[PDB]
Design a protein around this ligand. Structure first.
Ligand SMILES: CCCCCCCCCCC[C@@H](O)CC(=O)O[C@H]1[C@H](O)[C@@H](CO)O[C@H](OP(=O)(O)OP(=O)(O)OC[C@H]2O[C@@H](n3ccc(=O)[nH]c3=O)[C@H](O)[C@@H]2O)[C@@H]1NC(C)=O
Ligand SMILES: CCCCCCCCCCC[C@@H](O)CC(=O)O[C@H]1[C@H](O)[C@@H](CO)O[C@H](OP(=O)(O)OP(=O)(O)OC[C@H]2O[C@@H](n3ccc(=O)[nH]c3=O)[C@H](O)[C@@H]2O)[C@@H]1NC(C)=O
Ligand SMILES: CCCCCCCCCCC[C@@H](O)CC(=O)O[C@H]1[C@H](O)[C@@H](CO)O[C@H](OP(=O)(O)OP(=O)(O)OC[C@H]2O[C@@H](n3ccc(=O)[nH]c3=O)[C@H](O)[C@@H]2O)[C@@H]1NC(C)=O
Ligand SMILES: Cc1ccnc(-c2cc(C(=O)N3CCOC[C@H]3Cc3ccccc3F)[nH]n2)c1
Ligand SMILES: Cc1ccnc(-c2cc(C(=O)N3CCOC[C@H]3Cc3ccccc3F)[nH]n2)c1
Ligand SMILES: Cc1ccnc(-c2cc(C(=O)N3CCOC[C@H]3Cc3ccccc3F)[nH]n2)c1
Lengths: 263, 263, 263
């Protein structure tokens, strides 16, 4: 159902069954498939393809030549009716691609809210992007990658399948990420290695002096103490008893499957 | 001539003289030039530009915002009527570009069959891509590059002009290839260097234990023996007398013009 | 005003107020905003978006899926009416993006004449590109970058914000530029470092033997003498008293804000 207050350009092709919310705008030469839902106030500028079983939230801005919901590039995919979910107030720039999930990977590619996906960023099948993230130009996620809240990935950088980019991470440009990046960490290189705590990001986001200190101490446990990760996990959990921000490490360790990036 | 069983969307622009085969599908807002031939069952999803003297085989899937047959980026090119040939059952993803040849380089850009060209892959003028290859996102070939059968090139990787990517090669992501890559070799880095035989690929493709052993021994001759390439060529040819798979090296050496990638 | 000799395809959407010059060509499915000016003989092939306060010169060739004048990606930008200027005889290839300026950065993104911007090159807000430059595929400029006359940037290479790529520079592919590159210098790597004078480029462009020698001597002052930049500046200025080509260094030093790339 197309809301009576939505605008659908006469050259756009919105297939019967698509749901277009109030005050949405479907610009010229857009294609919107029959299983697409576009939330209130979302704008497709022009020349946008949205198809598949794809739900898009409110107040998104999707720029020309983006492809949202499309068949993924996993050779295992065979046409099953998988899904994309995109939240609210995202800015999805020219030529961005966001691909539907695979049955094998759980069936869902998900993007949260308030993200900035720059030109030609790629969100592969079964990726999970959180809130307030930035993918710079040509930042490329293989399948099943997690980009956690507030994480930022610099231009030309690619991430190997299943890797986790932890919350508040900053990955430099021109980098290649092959393992998991703990929350709060700066990473750079080919392959990417850790370069300390993203102190400036935490400062700007209202983390206290005490919390940043505890996070730096947890970083030192992981990377400077010389202990094994198995040894430091209970020490990090102990630290989190006083500084709850440190629990992000514990939660991340439980999800990590590829080991941590290391010097 | 447009086959009576082809579908041409009313918004597509197929110029008189284009040949569109049985059960092909030309989606919305596609442009097809008058010297284009599109084979039986091939689909142009939407927003595809195909022009030049360009022949496309059967059962291809070409995704939105791809540009096939276009004027190449070689400053030497002056508008001569050069050609593109594309085979069968390729998957050519969003924003892929495949450019026509140059007179100077032989007049022909060629792609075989059963290839997967991921988002924004670039096939420059006078390139030759074989069968069953994979170019991952943003993989970029300069002019005159050969990508031989079954070779795979990882995301963000670029290849310098005239280089050969040998059969069954695996080039990692985030790499820059400046010299020729012998068949069966894993290559990675900036600039790319060899990292052994692509054993897993050969195993999956039905190579025998004996053949893989011979290929590993030829690899050692090239890279571990410490001899010159001129010395090892007859030794590799001798080995190929028993193990025909090793002849791939001989054939490659004869085409190689840039020297081999080396540690 | 649309010149009576301009061609505007019936499927193109040229908003009232756009200025389209004599013998310009606006191809199918192009969108041209009301504050756009397109000069005599310029061609938009098809599927081109041009908007914003954007002035484009004569005899340009702009290929499909390019976005010229669009809202920039700087989170500081808030919709102010900033500008793009593009000169004459540029070749702007598929998927190139050129974004409008920011008030904070001066309000203007500028491109000169006779440039070749290859597939998916990115010109960010407030960049200044000169004349006769080449950006290869996926070459990506952050905001406020200067690319001076005749400079060339190889494929997959990105440039950090505010950096200057000096006149006649050659930056290799697969590189990441984080500081300023003096005129006449070859740069390569991640991060990019200097590799001597671009002798072949200067030779082809009519620089004299004496001028190239003086430029090589200025390069040695900067990078081989072991002196500080403050010491070498008057020595370079002294050299420029005889060889005016060396004044390019002086002019560059005055603009440089990020320090020079260094071994
Ligand atoms: C420095 C870091 C650089 C990172 C660069 C990342 C670039 C990502 C670009 C976006 C891609 C994304 O949209 C799709 C994606 O990631 O799909 C894959 C899917 O996430 C995965 C898991 O579910 O499975 C697949 O990847 P795998 O590598 O696990 O696939 P595979 O095991 O089927 O191997 C694919 C090909 O590689 C060959 N191969 C494999 C291993 C080997 O050792 N040698 C070899 O040749 C093999 O013969 C086959 O032809 C999937 N691929 C394919 C081609 O099917
Ligand atoms: C770590 C590896 C990274 C690899 C990255 C590869 C990225 C490829 C992107 C796709 C490009 C492809 O679509 C087109 C292509 O490759 O064309 C060229 C064509 O394959 C070639 C051969 O036939 O000839 C040309 O390349 P060359 O480098 O040989 O050209 P040229 O000799 O004319 O030089 C081009 C410019 O470089 C300048 N130059 C050259 C040499 C030098 O030492 N310094 C210098 O400034 C020279 O002044 C001129 O302005 C062609 N180029 C141009 C710009 O005309
Ligand atoms: C090896 C070299 C690789 C280079 C790769 C370059 C890729 C360029 C791709 C094209 C981008 C271009 O079109 C737009 C652009 O460059 O805009 C920026 C604008 O040129 C700049 C100056 O005017 O300002 C901005 O960059 P900054 O990095 O200065 O921005 P910021 O200080 O607002 O920080 C942005 C985010 O980074 C976070 N941050 C910052 C610093 C830090 O230490 N940690 C951290 O997390 C911070 O929380 C915030 O969410 C602008 N960005 C944003 C996202 O607003
Ligand atoms: C020296 C160095 C080393 C590695 N990388 C860089 C580098 C990377 C970006 C870049 O991609 N950015 C996108 C546009 O906003 C500007 C910037 C913001 C940003 C930074 C880091 C990660 C994600 C981001 F969004 N700029 N310089 C610089
Ligand atoms: C550790 C490491 C080092 C270098 N590179 C990598 C790396 C490269 C890719 C990648 O580009 N792929 C495309 C999507 O399918 C997944 C994968 C398949 C693939 C691998 C290699 C070459 C071509 C390919 F198609 N993933 N990790 C990883
Ligand atoms: C060995 C090495 C190291 C670093 N980089 C390379 C490398 C880079 C390009 C490339 O991007 N080119 C675009 C297409 O014309 C061909 C070439 C011209 C060119 C060269 C350098 C800078 C800008 C350019 F336009 N080819 N090889 C090679």
């Amino acid at each position: 159902m197309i809301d009576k207050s939505a605008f659908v350009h006469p050259t756009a092709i919105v297939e019967e069954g698509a749901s277009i919310g109030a005050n949405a705008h479907i610009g010229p030469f857009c294609i919107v498939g029959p299983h697409v839902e576009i939330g209130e106030g979302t704008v497709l500028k022009s020349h946008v393809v949205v198809n598949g079983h794809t739900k898009i939230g409110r107040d998104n801005e999707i720029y020309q030549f983006a492809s949202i919901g499309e068949v993924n590039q996993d050779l295992k995919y065979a046409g099953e009716p998988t899904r994309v979910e995109i939240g609210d107030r995202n800015r999805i720039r020219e030529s961005v691609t966001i691909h539907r999930g695979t049955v094998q990977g759980g069936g869902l590619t998900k993007v949260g809210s308030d993200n900035l996906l720059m030109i030609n960023a790629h969100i592969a099948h079964d990726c999970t992007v959180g809130n307030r993230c930035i993918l710079a130009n040509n930042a490329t996620l293989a399948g099943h990658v997690s980009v956690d809240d507030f994480a930022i990935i610099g231009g030309m950088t690619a991430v190997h399948q299943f890797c986790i980019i932890g919350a508040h991470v900053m990955v430099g440009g021109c980098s290649g990420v092959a393992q998991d990046v703990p929350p709060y960490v700066i990473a750079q290189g080919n392959h990417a290695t850790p370069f300390g705590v993203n102190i400036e990001g935490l400062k700007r986001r209202g983390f206290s002096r005490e919390a940043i200190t505890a996070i730096r101490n947890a970083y030192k446990l992981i990377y400077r103490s010389g202990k094994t990760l198995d040894e430091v996990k209970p020490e990090i959990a102990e630290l989190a008893e006083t500084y709850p921000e440190v629990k992000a490490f514990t939660d991340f360790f439980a999800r990590s499957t590829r080991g941590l990036i290391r010097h």
